[PDB]
Design an enzyme around this catalytic site. Sequence first.
Site, PDB file in Angstrom:
ATOM      1  N   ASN A   9      -8.842   5.582   3.259  1.00 32.99           N
ATOM      2  CA  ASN A   9      -9.565   6.381   2.274  1.00 32.99           C
ATOM      3  C   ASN A   9     -10.429   7.440   2.956  1.00 32.99           C
ATOM      4  O   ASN A   9     -11.113   7.156   3.944  1.00 32.99           O
ATOM      5  CB  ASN A   9     -10.447   5.437   1.439  1.00 32.99           C
ATOM      6  CG  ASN A   9     -10.956   6.051   0.164  1.00 32.99           C
ATOM      7  OD1 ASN A   9     -11.109   7.260   0.052  1.00 32.99           O
ATOM      8  ND2 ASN A   9     -11.247   5.200  -0.816  1.00 32.99           N
TER       9      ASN A   9
ATOM     10  N   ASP B 225      -6.269   8.517  -0.363  1.00 32.03           N
ATOM     11  CA  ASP B 225      -5.810   7.500   0.581  1.00 32.03           C
ATOM     12  C   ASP B 225      -4.577   8.010   1.316  1.00 32.03           C
ATOM     13  O   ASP B 225      -3.689   8.600   0.699  1.00 32.03           O
ATOM     14  CB  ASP B 225      -5.462   6.206  -0.146  1.00 32.03           C
ATOM     15  CG  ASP B 225      -6.586   5.713  -1.016  1.00 32.03           C
ATOM     16  OD1 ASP B 225      -7.754   5.730  -0.560  1.00 32.03           O
ATOM     17  OD2 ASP B 225      -6.298   5.337  -2.171  1.00 32.03           O
TER      18      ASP B 225
ATOM     19  N   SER C 225     -11.674  11.104  -3.802  1.00 30.43           N
ATOM     20  CA  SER C 225     -11.181  10.816  -2.465  1.00 30.43           C
ATOM     21  C   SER C 225      -9.678  10.517  -2.515  1.00 30.43           C
ATOM     22  O   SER C 225      -9.088  10.314  -3.576  1.00 30.43           O
ATOM     23  CB  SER C 225     -11.954   9.651  -1.852  1.00 30.43           C
ATOM     24  OG  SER C 225     -11.737   8.452  -2.577  1.00 30.43           O
TER      25      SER C 225
ATOM     26  N   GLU D 185       0.819  -1.210   0.000  1.00 38.22           N
ATOM     27  CA  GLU D 185       0.000   0.000   0.000  1.00 38.22           C
ATOM     28  C   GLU D 185       0.856   1.264   0.000  1.00 38.22           C
ATOM     29  O   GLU D 185       0.549   2.229  -0.716  1.00 38.22           O
ATOM     30  CB  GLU D 185      -0.930   0.012   1.217  1.00 38.22           C
ATOM     31  CG  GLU D 185      -2.081  -1.004   1.199  1.00 38.22           C
ATOM     32  CD  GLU D 185      -3.170  -0.688   0.174  1.00 38.22           C
ATOM     33  OE1 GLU D 185      -3.095   0.367  -0.505  1.00 38.22           O
ATOM     34  OE2 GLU D 185      -4.102  -1.512   0.045  1.00 38.22           O
TER      35      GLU D 185
ATOM     36  N   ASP E 204     -15.559  -4.314   9.565  1.00 35.63           N
ATOM     37  CA  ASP E 204     -16.783  -3.823   8.937  1.00 35.63           C
ATOM     38  C   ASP E 204     -17.489  -4.857   8.064  1.00 35.63           C
ATOM     39  O   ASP E 204     -18.446  -4.501   7.369  1.00 35.63           O
ATOM     40  CB  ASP E 204     -16.498  -2.557   8.111  1.00 35.63           C
ATOM     41  CG  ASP E 204     -15.895  -2.842   6.732  1.00 35.63           C
ATOM     42  OD1 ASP E 204     -15.587  -4.005   6.389  1.00 35.63           O
ATOM     43  OD2 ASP E 204     -15.718  -1.866   5.968  1.00 35.63           O
TER      44      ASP E 204
ATOM     45  N   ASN F 129      -7.832   8.923  -5.493  1.00 37.11           N
ATOM     46  CA  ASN F 129      -8.695   7.976  -6.187  1.00 37.11           C
ATOM     47  C   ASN F 129      -9.492   8.675  -7.285  1.00 37.11           C
ATOM     48  O   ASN F 129      -9.624   9.902  -7.306  1.00 37.11           O
ATOM     49  CB  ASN F 129      -9.654   7.302  -5.207  1.00 37.11           C
ATOM     50  CG  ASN F 129      -8.934   6.614  -4.081  1.00 37.11           C
ATOM     51  OD1 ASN F 129      -7.988   5.862  -4.312  1.00 37.11           O
ATOM     52  ND2 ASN F 129      -9.378   6.860  -2.850  1.00 37.11           N
TER      53      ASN F 129
ATOM     54  N   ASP G  63     -12.633   8.892  -7.784  1.00 36.63           N
ATOM     55  CA  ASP G  63     -13.829   9.594  -7.337  1.00 36.63           C
ATOM     56  C   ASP G  63     -13.519  10.884  -6.582  1.00 36.63           C
ATOM     57  O   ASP G  63     -14.439  11.514  -6.050  1.00 36.63           O
ATOM     58  CB  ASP G  63     -14.688   8.666  -6.467  1.00 36.63           C
ATOM     59  CG  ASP G  63     -14.030   8.326  -5.133  1.00 36.63           C
ATOM     60  OD1 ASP G  63     -12.841   8.657  -4.935  1.00 36.63           O
ATOM     61  OD2 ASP G  63     -14.710   7.728  -4.274  1.00 36.63           O
TER      62      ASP G  63
END
EC number: 3.2.1.17
Length: 129
Positions: free
Chosen positions: A59, A52, A50, A35, A101, A46, A48
Site C-alpha cells: 500500500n 496497492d 491510496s 492478493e 511492524d 483503495n 482512501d
Amino acid sequence: KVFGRCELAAAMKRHGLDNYRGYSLGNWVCAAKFESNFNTQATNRNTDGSTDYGILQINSRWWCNDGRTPGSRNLCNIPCSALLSSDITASVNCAKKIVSDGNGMNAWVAWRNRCKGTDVQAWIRGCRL
Ligand code: NA
C-alpha cells in the site's frame, strides 16, 4: 510477470521468506495468490485514495511513494512502480519490514480472510524446494 506457484515458492525461499518471523513458506504463497493471482503487475485502488502494488499488494499509504497519495509515508523508501517488476526483490524486502511492524501477516487482509487457519502447506505441495 505471472509466476507459477512453485516458481514463486522457490524465489521466496531464496529471498529468505521461509519461516520469516515464524511464517512458513505456504503462508506467503497463499497471500500472493489471493492478493495478486501471482501477477507482479497487479494494482488496486483503495477507498482512501491510496493504491496497492505488486505481487503482495503493498500500500502507498505507508510503504512506497507513487506521487499521488498526499500525506502518506514511504517506509520502504522506494517508488511504488519498483514493486511491479518481474524481479520480486523489492517486494520481498518491503514485505519483511511490514510483517515486522507488530501485526504480522494480519497486515494483508487477504491472508487473514483466506489463508489464516487453513492448511497453507498445501500451497507448496509438489514443489522441489
Ligand atoms: Na506513500
